[PDB]
Amino acid sequence: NMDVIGERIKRIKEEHNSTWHYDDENPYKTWAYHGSYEVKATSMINGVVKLLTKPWDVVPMVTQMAMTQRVFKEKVDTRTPRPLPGTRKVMEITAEWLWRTLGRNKRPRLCTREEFTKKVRTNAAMGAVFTEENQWDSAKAAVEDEEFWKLVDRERELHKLGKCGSCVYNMMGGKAKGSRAIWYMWLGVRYLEFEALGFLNEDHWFSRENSYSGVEGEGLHKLGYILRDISKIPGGAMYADDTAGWDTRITEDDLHNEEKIIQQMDPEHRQLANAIFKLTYQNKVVKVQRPTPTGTVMDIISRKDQRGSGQVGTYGLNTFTNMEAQLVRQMEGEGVLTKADLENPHLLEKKITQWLETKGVERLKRMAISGDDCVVKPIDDRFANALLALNDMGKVRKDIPQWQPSKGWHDWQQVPFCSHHFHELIMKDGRKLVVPCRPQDELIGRARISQGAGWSLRETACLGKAYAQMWSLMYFHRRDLRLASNAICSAVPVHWVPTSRTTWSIHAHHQWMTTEDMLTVWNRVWIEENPWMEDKTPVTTWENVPYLGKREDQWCGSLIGLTSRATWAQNIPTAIQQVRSLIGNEEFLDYM
């Protein structure tokens, strides 16, 4: 093991030779511990959103979010039992077939310094781009620096030689302030993963068109429609089981299966991806910021299995592995795989290959898969109790005894997916919309959080305006959110550009980051560009933009019907005016 990780620990040890020591009392049980060294340390409430959402002031979920994968929890420090030999064979056959299916039209390729620089710059507009970004360590600054690219080249040369000298990721046990040199090693490590494996996201290998089960690039506004289209396929209930800490359940077998994509690469690409897989994915070196009685320390730990949650390519490889694990469960449900097949070290391929070649693509079309998140509509309900391979692969379902059957839904609208459920709304003109929805306390609680501190009223109001505009595009069908959205947009200067991100979700397309008229953006998203909207007649007024049924709105967290809500709705112009007075002499517009 030290042959692959030695150089990295050696360099960390050398750079921190003053405070370096081996703590005999380290909390690590399943991660190899190498040593520690001394280190430094360091969310505000959005007063604009808070002032305009008074009824939610002390509401439990909202108050919780104000305080509250990157964290090194108890579950990260566990081992997953090794899958059985027949299970390992099935996974290998399925991984091989899946990669060949996913690569039928696309060819893997290297991603570039220019692609990375463009992504950094375009996302730097929305504030922070990375977890390691300080007020001194800007990704935009680093990307503009030729010295950063020189270090990248030097690390690549080591990777070409089958060695790694500086590729490390970080975890939380008040982020430690480090050197520009340390930050460059981190960003360079991310660029090198991006160069070798970024094609998966950049070339949309997991788009629905390319992967059948995938939803990458679709957007939150299409997710409900995809679930409604899956509902039309004949079969059993729709299952959406949650895996307890998916990333900790990624086995050495899963890692070796994900690696098979290198077989489709050109030699110069194959060489660099092979180095990312073998040296960094299969031999992780992690820095964990741990508090001690004297001060704060940084632990240098390492391990072979599990998913490096901090590493580029995680989404795609998680999506790949989940698609694979769900096909295997589908096969077990269909009686293709028995307990005796999973235990068998000489399991015959014929029937697994036959099922994949004849039913595989149809079976992928029955799923909506986004990383560890899955919705499956099997051919019948034998799937509910087909748990032998799922548990054996290590994908143990969250908060349910291992052998208790899964509970599915017979209504796609009850199905949870990507932190949402989706409703079908009838418009006054008879056209139907399929909208995303989540508990309202979660949306308001999120909107009340400002990312960091020292943010001026102007920057704060603009984040609020971004949240308000997201609500008008995605959550317009919630009475309280449309009202709060209209109040926020009325209180914030009309020509001020919404800045900073509202969400880090892969499904967010940020159509709300504009000064363009929200009704126009709404029409473009839900009517013009909506493929499930056959009649393109534009909606000319918000009065024609529908709401959830009163009962469904209330069930999903609405405060409508309460006195505190009625009082808020009536007194809202007063709160808007107060926000206006503090912002000052600017151009405002009344949206109430």
Ligand SMILES: Cc1oc2ccc(NS(=O)(=O)c3ccc(Cl)cc3)cc2c1C(=O)O
């Ligand atoms: C673990 C992690 O996942 C991310 C997922 C997305 C992002 N942000 S980013 O704008 O979208 C992005 C996404 C991909 C790449 Cl190569 C660069 C930057 C950052 C992280 C991150 C981290 O900074 O540590």
Ligand SMILES: Cc1oc2ccc(NS(=O)(=O)c3ccc(Cl)cc3)cc2c1C(=O)O
């Ligand atoms: C916009 C966006 O959100 C994400 C949310 C998650 C991910 N997953 S990712 O490959 O695993 C990843 C992991 C770590 C880092 Cl630093 C960047 C990206 C990627 C993106 C992404 C992108 O453009 O690549």
Ligand SMILES: [Zn+2]
């Ligand atoms: Zn490296």
Ligand SMILES: [Zn+2]
């Ligand atoms: Zn709802």
